[PDB]
Structures are given as structure tokens and as C-alpha cells.
């Protein structure tokens, strides 16, 4: 083994080698001398923080001002055309006219449409009348359908004024409560169709408020067999009605109550409890006596905690029973004498026993009675309590009547991430004659507006900031309304297994990376209020492969009108921006025959950014047809264009004359250098310039600069950052493209520090290889490694076929000890928005577990003795200071025959956290402050016992 000397020699070496080539072969220093010579052509502009956080949540807060002016409108045209309707029973000599949404018959007229393309929608739609649908199992033609089908036809008048004064407007709606939704503008509905309005999300939330829930289950000996296969998929089916904020536990009685979970008080019923409470209840026996007294005791205890959260509002209780002799009046007379709590009971399956007492439950207690004899009865007889629980709701009145959002989901027509808004309509018939009081204590239907997450996205300009800086807004839950790591893909609870529905309910803590204060920062904006916080934070880049420390201000504010807090997260080095002043025709021009496609051989292989330059420019995945639309889109029409914008297409050609001088000046003087695969350039504006046009085939990167992994990451640093290549063929080049050198540059214009673009090379392993020898030995291994455990290179010549691989993948004696110095530090989370191929017991959603490392301290050089058991490897680790790069020289793996487990960096499919103590210690949230129960002048005659 050598002396430290000598390697930090030898290491030394590899400093002033490696960094002058990455200096002279890329000129980043000058590229910021190209900046400073033309610094009149720009001018630099303040980015305020506190300002653009305002100014895009007032945007925001119209945007969805707009939609519930919208609202308002359909809910009071809605209430007087129904009053005015009378029911009529003869639908044959008078037809009704509509437009079916699922077709391709006496009684009513179907509609045949235009359908005209259009954009916005990703379909065929129709702007001259509303379409309806109609569940499966509901029969249009019906007394009751039809009926609902007259009324709701001056709804399409409402509909197009709407849309008239904002031609913005996506998806209107009216969920009726019969079960048809008519919805503008028409187009044709999406094996079989299972659709039904009313068990929407948008639909429950706006027809009741929330609940807390407590399902009692009927396990004795006398349910085994089908009914309780009918009990286990009822309970799985009246989970699906609610929502995140309603609370729920599942118990269950066999003489003795207990819980069915790992739960043992309410809890949240997200989508991660509900999925406990599912799986627990699939595996319930029925064996055992009834005891109702029992039973119902543990409910009206479990209802009575006030320990943990709770919703402190409907407070209910489903006993999932067939029949029985006891009516256990002692313990209602004990537990509600004032009857604050109501009680729903369910008769399942065929039998003979007595539903007497079952009935009388859900009289007293002011409930309601339904009765579940087959799987085809299990979906309406689970979602009808819905009903009883809006009677307080509607005699509030005009109090009753506020604008709801929903949490973010899928729209079950194709839009993408969409949010609702609701608003509930009432039936107001004889109103005027103030005695009705019959019917009237039920709602009608919920309205319904869509408001896509696109719409809000381009509320909160990006381009002006860094591209490591993004808004995001949550609700008053910490699920994010909009943020840059939410997919449009459902959420995961879990290992996928083989033998639209629910919300895309992402954390704001499980969007990034979880510290201590982003915690009471997602606290404080919960609590609607406004701050700022500069602190340092450990930030993922883009490829889930590196962990990068940097400073950042996350600065917020409460939207006004609603619920929602959008904040900025402005880091350092991104407060002033470059805004491009140019006005010239000519030198202009100068700029544009810089990106002509023809030119390419003199300019290198340029890309442009698919971002939103104009109104009137399609864009597209193919940079080559997008290269190709943008520059016969500059000539053909003036810059002086009132159609689009002004900031972004001067920016891109400002960006052009300042990229081509380096290639012309700089690049062109020199073509082969050592050893340089590729010079590349890439800039805030847009562009990316790779010096070789041969070369450009092997750049893979996105042609967004500001979605791009190396940009982002050395934008943080003040060094070189090298890019490891991937593995298994995942991009073509391993020896044939290079390894990636990246480095931001940096200007000074008045004091203010800049960093407009990063340059950087592609330097080639195999004459990297030769600075490195001065060699396939058998003794001793020596090898680099970047920030993050990836190999670059090696002596043995067989691990350097495996580059760009982790080094626990090849070394795992090695890399663990490594990690045990503290040298390579490590933060796991959860990916909760992914896909993995299934297992077994068509790639569905799951969790995979992520893992990164990163430099621990500021320590230089390390060295230590490997001990894997009767051996003694010794091993000299050293830092290249100015790059992310350490070297390590080690003996060789075959001196100790030792192999323990390998360490893996990649995504592992999980099924973390374990939610059986994450509701123990929850986050916080806050919950709505509206809460509609327990009015004296509801009716507690209609149950659906006490008739037949
Ligand atoms: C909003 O509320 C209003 C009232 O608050 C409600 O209008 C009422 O609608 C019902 C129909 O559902 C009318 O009932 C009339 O009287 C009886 C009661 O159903 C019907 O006679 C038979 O009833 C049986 C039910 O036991 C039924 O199966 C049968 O089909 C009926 N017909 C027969 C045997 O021929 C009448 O047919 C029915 N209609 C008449 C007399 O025209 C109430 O009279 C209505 N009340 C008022 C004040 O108009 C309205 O439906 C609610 N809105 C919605 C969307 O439901
Ligand atoms: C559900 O039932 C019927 C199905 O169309 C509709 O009732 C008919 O609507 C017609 C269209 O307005 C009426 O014709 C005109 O009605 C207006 C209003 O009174 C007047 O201009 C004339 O009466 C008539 N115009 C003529 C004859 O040139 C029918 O009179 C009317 N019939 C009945 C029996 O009501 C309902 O409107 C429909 N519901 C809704 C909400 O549209
Ligand atoms: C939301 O509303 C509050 C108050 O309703 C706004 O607070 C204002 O803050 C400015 C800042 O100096 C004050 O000058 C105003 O006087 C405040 N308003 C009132 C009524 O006192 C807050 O700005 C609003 N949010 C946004 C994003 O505009
Ligand atoms: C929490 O729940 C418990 C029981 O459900 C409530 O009762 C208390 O239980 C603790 C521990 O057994 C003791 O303090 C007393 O035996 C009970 N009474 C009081 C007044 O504490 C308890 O009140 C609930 N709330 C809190 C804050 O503990
Ligand atoms: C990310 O990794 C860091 C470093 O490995 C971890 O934070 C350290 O946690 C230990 C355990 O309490 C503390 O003693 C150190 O002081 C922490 N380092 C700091 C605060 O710099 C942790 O695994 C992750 N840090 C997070 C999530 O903030
Ligand atoms: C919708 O909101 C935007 C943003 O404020 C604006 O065009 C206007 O306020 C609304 N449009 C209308 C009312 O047509
Ligand atoms: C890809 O699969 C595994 C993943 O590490 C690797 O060991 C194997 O050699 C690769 N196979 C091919 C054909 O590239
Ligand atoms: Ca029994």
C-alpha cells in the first residue's frame, strides 16, 4: 500500500488535468466574457418574491371567482325551472328531445350531432346543446327520468351563456339526484360502463357535509355463508363514499365487539386507511352468538373520544346485521337520549329472521333502514344515506349554499388532473306557498364546474424564475393542488398483486424531500397566514439519483376567496432575472438565421425549448418539427405581432447571438481536442447548442432547458458537476457518448450575480483512460466515483464495462463501510405516484422506496482499514476538489474471499409507511368550518321500516 502523499500527488493530478480541459474545451470562462461585452443588449430586473406570490394568488383566486359566478347562475336557474315544472305521467303524445352520451324508441327523441374538433378538451365536442348520461341499471323511459329530462332542459341555456362570457370554460354538470347527469358541451361517452353520478366525489361533497362514521358488522355464527360475503362487500362499498375529510373506523360484534384493523379509534379515511380497513374486513369469520348490547357500547364509546382528530360533525353509526329479537333500547336511552347521534341499519341477504328490532333502530335514532338481498343491491342501497344526512343541510337555506373544490383527481371523461367545484340545488316547489315540507327536504342534485390544473399552471409564469424555482399551492390538508412532482397517475397503497375513482391525494411533505422546517412551514400556510423563510434544504434532482444542498425562500400567501396557499420557492442566485431589450429588425434578424436548421453545420446541432411562444405555434414532441415551425414563424409574421408574447421569443433570440458567438468564436477555432465527444451549451432561454452535429444524436436530454437534470444541478453547485451515464442500455452511447461535465457560468452586471447558462463536455472514457494509467492489475483496485456512489471508471477493465452503475452494485464491502465513515450520507423517501410490474399470488401503480446519496462533510481525504472477517483491507479515499468526484484506491476483491449482500441505489417496490402508527401522531391539517346537523324541523318520519 502507498503513502498519502503520493496519491494526493496522484490525485492531484486529476485536478489540473481534468478541470483545465472542462475550462478550455467548453469556455465557461468565456461564455461570461460574451455576456459582459453586450451587457446594454439586456437589462437585469428584480424577480420580487413577496410580489409575484401575490399577485399570481389574486389570479388565482378570480380564475375561481369566475367559476362560482358560474355556479350561482346554474343553482338559481335550476331552482325556478324545476318549481315551475308539472308532473306529468304521458310521455307518448308529448316526446322529450335529448341527446343520449352513450349511444351511437317512443316516449323521447334522441339528437344527432355535429361534433366538431375543437381544442381545450382532448375530444369531439358539441357547443349547441348539453349531453346526458344515464346509468346502466337505470331505465330511461321511466316516470321518474323522463320527468327529470323535461326541466333540466332550460339548463342548456344557462349553459352556453357561461360559456359565452368565459370561452375558457370546461365541463358544466348536474348531477341529478335520480341519477342522470346532464353535462356541456355534449360529447359521446367514454367493457362496461359502472359510471354514476352519485357516487362522485364531487357529488358526496356537496350533498352532505362531512361525516364521522363508525360501521358496525354483524359476525356472529347466523351471517356465514353468502351473507356475509354481501356484509363484507357492502362495507367495502360504502368506504368508496368518503372522502379525506370524513373520519372512519369499522368494528365488529360476535358476543364480545372489537375492531376489525390496527386502528382502534377514528381515523382519517384517506386513501391509505381506507386500504387497511378493506384488507381487514375481507378477512372477518362469522362464528359466534349475537349480542347487540355489546356491540353498540363499543360504538357510542368509539364516537365519544375527543382524544384525536375527529370531524366534530355527522355523527353515525351502519350496523351491518340480517335480523334478530333484541332492540337493545337500554343502551340508546344511555348513550343518546338527545339523539345527537343517528343510526343507520342494513338487513343483508336472504333469511328468515326478524327484521322488527332492525327497523325500529333506524326510527328512533333518526336513521334510516335499507335492505341489501344481493350483490346487484349492494351499490344504491350503500350511497342512499346520503339523503338523510342533507335534510339539515337544505333547511339552512341560502347558508347551505357555498362553493366547494374537491381535491385533485381524474376526470372520467379523459381531461387530466381536474378540481370541482359544487353547489348544491334544492327543490323550492310550493315555497311561495311555504307548506310543502314533503319532498323538499331533499336536494335535487349538485352542480358541478371543472377547473383543469393546467388552467391554474399558467396563472403562475415560470419562465421568468431559475429552473430550480416553482410555485405550489395546498389545500387545507397538505395535498397539493399544484406542484411539480404531481403525476397525472393515481396514488399507490401498496404491493400490486395478481390471482378516476379516487383522488390523486399527494402530501405537499411527500411531494419533496421531508425536513423539520418544512413542516412548520407547511403548518404555517395551513393556517392561512403569510411569511418567509431563507434556510438551507436538501433538494432532489431531477433524476431520482443525486441529493443537492442549496439555499431556498420559500415565500407564501392564503388565497382570499378560498381555501388554498400558494407559495414560491425562490432560491438564491434566481432574485434578479435578465429581460431581453432588443428593438431592431435587423440585428434581430442576425439572431434568427442563427437556429436555421440548414445552417447546422458551422452553428452546431441547436434545440429549442417547446415552450409557449405563441398562441398560433403548435407544439410538439419532435424538436425537429418544432425547430422547423418556429423559425417560419419569426419571418412570415413581424415581431411586432399583438397576438403573442413579447419577453419569451426575445429572450430565445437574444439567447441565439450570445450561444453562436462561443461556437464561432471559441468552438470553431478548435474541432478536436484530446479527447471531447461533445460541446454542448444550454441556456435559460431555450436553446441547446451541440458543437458537433454528428454528436447532437447522442444528446438525450429533454429539449425543455428547465426540466433538464445536469442544468438544475450544477446550477447549486460552484464546481463541476459530472453527469454518471446509465446502465442496461437504458440510452444509447455508453464509451459512445461521453461522460458528462457540467459547469454554470456566472456574471456580475452591477454587483448582482447571474446564472444565465451552463456549459460543460462530454469527454470520452477511452481517453480518459490514459490520463488515468499513468493497470489491470489483480492486486489493487483504484476508481473515482461523482457525488452519489456512481462509478465513472476503473482499473480492472471489467468493472469500467459497468460504468455509470452504483458502486454497492459491484463493491458491496466497500461501499457499505463507506457509508459507515460518513462519507457518503443517505436520505430514503417514498415515491407514492409510481408504476412497477405486478407480482403474484398489466403494470399498476405502487410505492418504491428511492435512496440518494450524498457528500456527508467538507473532509478531504479519508483512510481506513477494511475488516469483512480474517482479512485486512486497506483503502486511501481522496476528494477531487473543484469537481464532485472522490478517489478511492483499494486492494483488489479477490486478496479476502469475502461477498457479502449488495447495497442497490434504484427504486424498491414497498409498501411503507406503516400506517398502523402513522395515525397515532398525524400531520396537521385543519378541517371546514361549516357543519349542518341536528335541525328541529326535520321531518324523522321517513324511514324505511316504519311504511312497510
Ligand atoms: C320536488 O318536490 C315536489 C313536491 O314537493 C315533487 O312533486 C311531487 O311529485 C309526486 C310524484 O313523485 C306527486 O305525486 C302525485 O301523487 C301520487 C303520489 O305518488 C301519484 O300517484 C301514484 O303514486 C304511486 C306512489 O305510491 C306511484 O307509484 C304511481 O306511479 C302514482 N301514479 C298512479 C298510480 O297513477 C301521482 O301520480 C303523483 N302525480 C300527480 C298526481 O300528478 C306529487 O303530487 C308532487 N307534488 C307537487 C306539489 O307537485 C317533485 O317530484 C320533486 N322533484 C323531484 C325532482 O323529485
Ligand atoms: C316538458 O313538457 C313539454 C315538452 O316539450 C313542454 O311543454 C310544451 O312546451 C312548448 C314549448 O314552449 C309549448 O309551446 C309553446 O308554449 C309557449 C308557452 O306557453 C307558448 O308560446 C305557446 O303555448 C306554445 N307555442 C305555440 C303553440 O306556438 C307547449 O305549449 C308546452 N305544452 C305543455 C302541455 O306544457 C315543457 O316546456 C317541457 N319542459 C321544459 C322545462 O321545457
Ligand atoms: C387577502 O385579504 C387580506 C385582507 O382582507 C389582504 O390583506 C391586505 O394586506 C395589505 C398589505 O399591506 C394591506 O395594505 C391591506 O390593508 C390588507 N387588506 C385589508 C382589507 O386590510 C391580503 O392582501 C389579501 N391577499 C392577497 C393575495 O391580496
Ligand atoms: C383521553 O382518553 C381518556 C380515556 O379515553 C380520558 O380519560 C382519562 O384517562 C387518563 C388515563 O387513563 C386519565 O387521565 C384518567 O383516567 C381519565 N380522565 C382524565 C380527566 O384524564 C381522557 O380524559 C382523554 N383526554 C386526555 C387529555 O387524556
Ligand atoms: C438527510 O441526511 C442527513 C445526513 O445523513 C440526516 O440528518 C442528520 O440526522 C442526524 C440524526 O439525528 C443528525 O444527528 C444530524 O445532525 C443530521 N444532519 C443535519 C441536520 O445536517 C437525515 O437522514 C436527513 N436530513 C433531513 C431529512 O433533514
Ligand atoms: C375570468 O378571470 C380572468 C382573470 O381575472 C379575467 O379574464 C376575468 O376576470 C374573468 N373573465 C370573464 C369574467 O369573462
Ligand atoms: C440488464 O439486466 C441486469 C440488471 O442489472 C443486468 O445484470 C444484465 O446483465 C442486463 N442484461 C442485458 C441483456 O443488458
Ligand atoms: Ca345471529
Given at each position: 500500500f502507498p503513502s498519502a502523499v503520493t496519491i494526493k500527488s496522484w490525485v492531484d493530478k486529476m485536478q489540473e488535468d481534468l478541470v483545465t480541459l472542462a475550462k478550455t474545451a467548453s469556455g465557461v470562462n468565456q461564455l461570461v466574457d460574451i455576456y459582459e461585452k453586450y451587457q446594454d443588449l439586456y437589462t437585469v430586473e428584480p424577480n420580487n418574491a413577496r410580489q409575484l406570490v401575490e399577485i399570481a394568488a389574486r389570479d388565482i383566486e378570480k380564475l375561481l371567482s369566475n367559476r362560482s359566478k358560474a355556479l350561482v347562475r346554474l343553482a338559481l336557474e335550476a331552482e325556478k325551472v324545476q318549481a315551475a315544472?308539472?308532473?306529468?305521467?304521458?310521455?307518448?303524445?308529448?316526446?322529450?328531445?335529448?341527446?343520449?352520451?352513450?349511444?351511437?324508441?317512443?316516449?323521447?327523441?334522441?339528437?344527432?350531432?355535429?361534433?366538431?374538433?375543437?381544442?381545450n378538451f382532448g375530444?369531439?365536442?358539441?357547443?349547441?346543446?348539453?349531453?346526458?348520461?344515464?346509468?346502466?341499471?337505470?331505465?330511461?323511459?321511466?316516470?321518474?327520468?323522463?320527468?327529470?329530462?323535461?326541466?333540466?332542459?332550460?339548463?342548456?341555456?344557462?349553459?352556453?351563456?357561461?360559456?359565452?362570457?368565459?370561452?375558457?370554460?370546461?365541463?358544466?354538470?348536474?348531477?341529478?339526484?335520480?341519477?342522470?347527469?346532464?353535462?356541456?358541451?355534449?360529447?359521446?361517452?367514454?367493457?362496461?360502463?359502472?359510471?354514476?353520478?352519485?357516487?362522485?366525489?364531487?357529488?358526496?361533497?356537496?350533498?352532505?357535509?362531512?361525516?364521522?362514521?363508525?360501521?358496525?358488522?354483524?359476525?356472529?355464527?347466523?351471517?356465514?355463508?353468502?351473507?356475509?360475503?354481501?356484509?363484507?362487500?357492502?362495507?367495502?362499498?360504502?368506504?368508496?363514499?368518503?372522502?379525506?375529510?370524513?373520519?372512519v373506523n369499522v368494528a365488529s360484534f360476535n358476543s364480545n365487539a372489537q375492531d376489525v384493523s390496527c386502528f382502534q379509534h377514528l381515523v382519517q379515511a384517506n386513501v391509505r386507511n381506507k386500504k387497511v380497513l378493506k384488507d381487514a374486513v375481507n378477512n372477518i369469520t362469522a362464528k359466534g352468538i349475537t349480542d347487540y348490547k355489546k356491540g353498540f357500547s363499543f360504538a357510542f364509546e368509539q364516537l365519544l373520544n375527543y382524544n384525536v382528530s375527529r370531524a366534530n360533525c355527522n355523527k353515525i353509526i351502519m350496523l351491518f346485521t340480517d335480523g334478530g329479537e333484541e332492540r337493545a333500547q337500554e343502551i340508546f336511552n344511555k348513550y343518546n337520549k338527545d339523539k345527537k347521534v343517528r343510526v343507520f341499519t342494513f338487513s343483508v341477504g336472504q333469511h328468515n329472521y326478524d327484521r322488527g328490532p332492525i327497523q325500529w333502530m333506524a326510527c328512533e335514532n333518526k336513521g334510516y333502514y335499507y335492505e341489501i338481498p344481493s350483490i346487484g343491491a349492494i351499490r344504491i342501497n350503500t350511497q342512499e344515506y346520503l339523503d338523510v344526512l342533507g335534510r339539515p343541510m337544505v333547511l339552512a337555506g341560502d347558508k347551505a349554499k357555498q362553493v366547494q373544490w374537491t381535491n385533485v383527481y381524474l376526470d372520467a371523461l379523459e381531461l387530466g388532473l381536474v378540481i370541482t367545484g359544487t353547489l348544491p340545488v334544492f327543490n323550492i316547489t310550493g315555497q311561495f306557498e311555504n307548506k310543502t315540507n314533503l319532498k323538499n327536504q331533499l336536494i335535487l342534485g349538485v352542480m358541478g364546474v371543472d377547473v383543469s390544473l393546467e388552467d391554474i399552471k399558467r396563472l403562475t409564469p415560470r419562465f421568468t424564475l431559475c429552473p430550480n424555482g416553482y410555485y405550489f399551492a395546498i389545500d387545507p390538508?397538505?395535498?397539493?393542488?399544484?406542484?411539480?412532482?404531481?403525476?397525472?397517475?393515481?396514488?399507490?397503497?401498496?404491493?400490486?398483486?395478481?390471482?378516476?375513482?379516487?383522488?390523486?391525494?399527494?402530501?405537499?411533505?411527500?411531494?419533496?424531500?421531508?425536513?423539520?422546517?418544512?413542516?412548520?412551514?407547511?403548518?404555517?400556510?395551513?393556517?392561512?397566514?403569510?411569511?418567509?423563510?431563507?434556510?438551507r434544504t436538501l433538494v432532489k434532482s431531477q433524476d431520482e439519483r443525486y441529493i443537492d444542498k442549496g439555499n431556498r425562500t420559500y415565500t407564501w400567501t392564503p388565497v382570499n376567496g378560498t381555501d388554498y396557499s400558494l407559495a414560491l420557492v425562490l432560491p438564491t442566485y434566481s432574485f434578479y432575472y435578465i429581460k431581453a431589450k432588443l428593438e431592431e429588425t435587423i440585428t434581430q434578424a442576425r439572431y434568427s438565421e442563427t437556429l436555421k436548421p440548414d445552417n447546422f453545420e458551422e452553428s452546431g446541432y441547436t434545440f429549442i425549448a417547446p415552450r409557449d411562444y405563441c398562441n398560433?405555434?403548435?407544439?410538439?414532441?419532435?424538436?425537429?418539427?418544432?425547430?422547423?415551425?418556429?423559425?417560419?414563424?419569426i419571418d412570415r409574421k413581424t415581431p411586432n405581432n399583438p397576438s403573442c408574447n413579447a419577453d419569451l421569443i426575445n429572450r430565445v433570440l437574444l439567447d441565439a447571438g450570445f450561444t453562436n458567438e462561443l461556437?464561432?468564436?471559441?468552438?470553431?477555432?478548435?474541432?478536436?481536442?484530446?479527447?471531447?465527444?461533445?460541446?454542448?451549451?444550454?441556456?435559460?432561454?431555450?436553446?441547446?447548442?451541440?458543437?458537433?452535429?454528428?454528436?447532437?444524436?447522442?444528446?438525450?436530454?429533454?429539449?425543455?432547458?428547465?426540466?433538464?437534470?445536469?442544468?438544475?444541478?450544477?446550477?447549486?453547485?460552484?464546481?463541476?458537476?459530472?453527469?454518471?451515464?446509465?446502465?442496461?442500455?437504458?440510452?444509447?452511447?455508453?464509451?459512445?457518448?461521453?461522460?458528462?461535465?457540467?459547469?454554470?457560468?456566472?456574471?456580475?452586471?452591477?454587483?448582482?450575480?447571474?446564472?444565465?447558462?451552463?456549459?460543460?463536455?462530454?469527454?470520452?472514457?477511452?481517453?480518459?483512460?490514459?490520463?488515468?494509467?499513468?493497470?489491470?492489475?489483480?492486486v489493487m483496485d483504484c476508481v473515482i466515483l461523482d457525488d452519489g456512489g456512481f462509478l465513472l471508471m476503473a482499473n480492472h477493465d471489467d468493472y469500467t464495462n459497468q460504468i455509470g452503475?452504483?458502486?454497492?452494485?459491484?463493491?458491496?464491502?466497500?461501499?457499505?463501510?463507506?457509508?459507515?465513515?460518513?462519507?457518503?450520507?443517505?436520505?430514503?423517501?417514498?415515491?407514492?405516484?409510481?408504476?412497477?410490474?405486478?407480482?403474484?399470488?398489466?403494470?399498476?401503480?405502487?410505492?418504491?422506496?428511492?435512496?440518494?446519496?450524498?457528500?456527508?462533510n467538507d473532509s478531504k481525504s479519508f483512510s481506513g482499514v477494511l475488516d469483512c472477517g480474517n482479512c485486512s483491507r486497506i483503502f486511501h479515499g481522496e476528494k477531487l476538489m473543484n469537481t464532485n468526484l472522490i478517489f478511492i484506491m483499494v486492494e483488489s476483491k479477490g486478496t479476502c474471499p469475502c461477498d457479502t449482500r449488495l447495497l442497490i441505489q434504484a427504486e424498491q417496490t414497498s409498501d411503507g409507511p406503516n400506517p398502523c402508527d402513522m395515525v397515532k401522531q398525524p400531520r396537521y391539517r385543519k378541517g371546514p368550518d361549516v357543519c349542518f346537523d341536528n335541525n328541529v324541523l326535520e321531518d324523522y318520519t321517513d324511514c324505511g321500516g316504519v311504511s312497510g
Open positions: 315544472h308539472q308532473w306529468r305521467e304521458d310521455f307518448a303524445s308529448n316526446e322529450v328531445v335529448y341527446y343520449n352520451a352513450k349511444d351511437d324508441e317512443p316516449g323521447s327523441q334522441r339528437i344527432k350531432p355535429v361534433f366538431i374538433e375543437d381544442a375530444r369531439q365536442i358539441s357547443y349547441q346543446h348539453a349531453a346526458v348520461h344515464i346509468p346502466t341499471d337505470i331505465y330511461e323511459g321511466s316516470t321518474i327520468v323522463l320527468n327529470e329530462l323535461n326541466w333540466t332542459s332550460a339548463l342548456d341555456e344557462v349553459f352556453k351563456k357561461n360559456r359565452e362570457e368565459d370561452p375558457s370554460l370546461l365541463w358544466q354538470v348536474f348531477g341529478s339526484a335520480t341519477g342522470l347527469a346532464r353535462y356541456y358541451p355534449a360529447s359521446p361517452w367514454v367493457k362496461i360502463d359502472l359510471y354514476d353520478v352519485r357516487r362522485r366525489p364531487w357529488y358526496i361533497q356537496g350533498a352532505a357535509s362531512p361525516k364521522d362514521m363508525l360501521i358496525l358488522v354483524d359476525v356472529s355464527g347466523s351471517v356465514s355463508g353468502l351473507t356475509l360475503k354481501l356484509i363484507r362487500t357492502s362495507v367495502s362499498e360504502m368506504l368508496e363514499t368518503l372522502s379525506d375529510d370524513d373520519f390538508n397538505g395535498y397539493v393542488l399544484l406542484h411539480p412532482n404531481l403525476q397525472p397517475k393515481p396514488i399507490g397503497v401498496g404491493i400490486p398483486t395478481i390471482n378516476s375513482q379516487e383522488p390523486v391525494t399527494l402530501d405537499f411533505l411527500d411531494a419533496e424531500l421531508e425536513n423539520d422546517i418544512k413542516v412548520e412551514i407547511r403548518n404555517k400556510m395551513i393556517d392561512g397566514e403569510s411569511g418567509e423563510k431563507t434556510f398560433d405555434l403548435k407544439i410538439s414532441d419532435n424538436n425537429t418539427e418544432f425547430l422547423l415551425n418556429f423559425n417560419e414563424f461556437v464561432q468564436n471559441y468552438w470553431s477555432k478548435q474541432k478536436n481536442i484530446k479527447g471531447v465527444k461533445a460541446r454542448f451549451v444550454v441556456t435559460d432561454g431555450g436553446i441547446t447548442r451541440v458543437y458537433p452535429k454528428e454528436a447532437g444524436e447522442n444528446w438525450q436530454e429533454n429539449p425543455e432547458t428547465y426540466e433538464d437534470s445536469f442544468y438544475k444541478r450544477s446550477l447549486d453547485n460552484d464546481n463541476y458537476v459530472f453527469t454518471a451515464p446509465y446502465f442496461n442500455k437504458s440510452g444509447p452511447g455508453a464509451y459512445e457518448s461521453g461522460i458528462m461535465v457540467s459547469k454554470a457560468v456566472e456574471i456580475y452586471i452591477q454587483g448582482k450575480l447571474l446564472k444565465p447558462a451552463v456549459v460543460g463536455i462530454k469527454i470520452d472514457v477511452n481517453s480518459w483512460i490514459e490520463n488515468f494509467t499513468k493497470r489491470n492489475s489483480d452503475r452504483f458502486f454497492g452494485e459491484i463493491d458491496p464491502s466497500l461501499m457499505r463501510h463507506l457509508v459507515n465513515i460518513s462519507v457518503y450520507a443517505f436520505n430514503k423517501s417514498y415515491d407514492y405516484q409510481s408504476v412497477c410490474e405486478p407480482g403474484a399470488a398489466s403494470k399498476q401503480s405502487c410505492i418504491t422506496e428511492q435512496t440518494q446519496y450524498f457528500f456527508d
